[PDB]
Curated annotation (Swiss-Prot):
Similarity section: Belongs to the protein kinase superfamily. Ser/Thr protein kinase family. Aurora subfamily.
Known tissue expression: Highly expressed in testis and weakly in skeletal muscle, thymus and spleen. Also highly expressed in colon, ovarian, prostate, neuroblastoma, breast and cervical cancer cell lines.
PTM sites of type Phosphoserine: S216
EC numbers for this chain: 2.7.11.1
Record protein name field: Aurora kinase A
Length: 265
């Protein structure tokens, strides 16, 4: 069906390990979208063909306002092209660099939209497993949208591909190669809630080795400015034992969330 010839290409929207994401307009419809480019050689060298199919299969079939749409794909002997919904206000990552910390209203609102989208995913026992600021994008009304489903799967699962980059958002069971389920996304939710309010993730250290120690032993402290209700919700999500982590309904109806968030469940 579609091919490169159908699109005018504009400025780069961002870069990832494999992905190079461009602004684009489809010639006859004038439809604006984002084109994610993957190099076949690189995919093959790394052997993540299976992750790509997972990304395409899972994301194309999900429909939720807080989840980024995937419309289609094509390829061309050197590259694979994913056709994505364009998010015009950029990443949560960028917004955090700009402002340093989010206030309590902004944080709770983001956590609600996340919990809504994740609840929807978990209801088809899809777990995302790569929830972090550079994979959270913003729509034209500033609403959060989960993107990058390259690491997603069905639960329960094992991990067998290598974790290349940062540990900062992964629970103990996942970094230890043990087996995991849905509850991994709830841990990452606690990691995000802290980073939103403080400006850095709770287990951040100077080395891989030290970061790994701090996650497995759940070693973090709060700054004085973090209120009691935020401490309460964050302490609940960062349980070593997955089973002791809350359900998502318990996150959405937590008092701190209800007092501060400006969108509903
Ligand atoms: N639909 C989109 N709209 C705007 N920017 C995007 C979009 N998709 C990706 N980006 C930008 O490109 C970066 C890489 O996209 P992503 O799909 O996460 O690639 P990777 O799989 O390599 O992490 C993102 O962090 C974001 O900055
Ligand atoms: O609902 C849709 C499905 C596909 C789509 C596309 C734009 C350009 C190529 S394909 N835009 N909107
Ligand atoms: Mg990404
Ligand atoms: Mg990816």
């Amino acid at each position: 069906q579609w091919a490169l010839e159908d699109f005018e290409i504009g400025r780069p929207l961002g870069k990832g390990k494999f992905g190079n994401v461009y602004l684009a307009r489809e010639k006859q419809s004038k439809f604006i979208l984002a084109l994610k480019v993957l190099f076949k050689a690189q995919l093959e060298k790394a052997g993540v063909e299976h992750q790509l199919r997972r990304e395409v299969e899972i994301q194309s079939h999900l429909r939720h306002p807080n989840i980024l749409r995937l419309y289609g794909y094509f390829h061309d002997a050197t590259r694979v092209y994913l056709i994505l919904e364009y998010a015009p206000l950029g990443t949560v990552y960028r917004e955090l660099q700009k402002l340093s910390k989010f206030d309590e209203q902004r944080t709770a609102t983001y956590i609600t939209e996340l919990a809504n989208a994740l609840s929807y995913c978990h209801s088809k026992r899809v777990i995302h497993r790569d929830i972090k600021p550079e994979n959270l994008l913003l729509g034209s009304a500033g609403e959060l949208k989960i993107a990058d489903f390259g690491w997603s799967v069905h639960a329960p699962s094992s991990r067998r591909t290598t974790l290349a980059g940062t540990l900062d958002y992964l629970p103990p069971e996942m970094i230890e190669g043990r087996m995991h389920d849905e509850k991994v996304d709830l841990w990452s939710l606690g990691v995000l809630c802290y980073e939103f309010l403080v400006g850095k993730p709770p287990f951040e250290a100077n080395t891989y080795q030290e970061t790994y120690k701090r996650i497995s032993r759940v070693e973090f402290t709060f700054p004085d400015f973090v209120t009691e209700g935020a401490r309460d919700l964050i302490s609940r999500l960062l349980k070593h034992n997955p089973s002791q982590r809350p359900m998502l309904r318990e996150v959405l109806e937590h008092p701190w969330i209800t007092a501060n968030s400006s969108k509903p469940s």
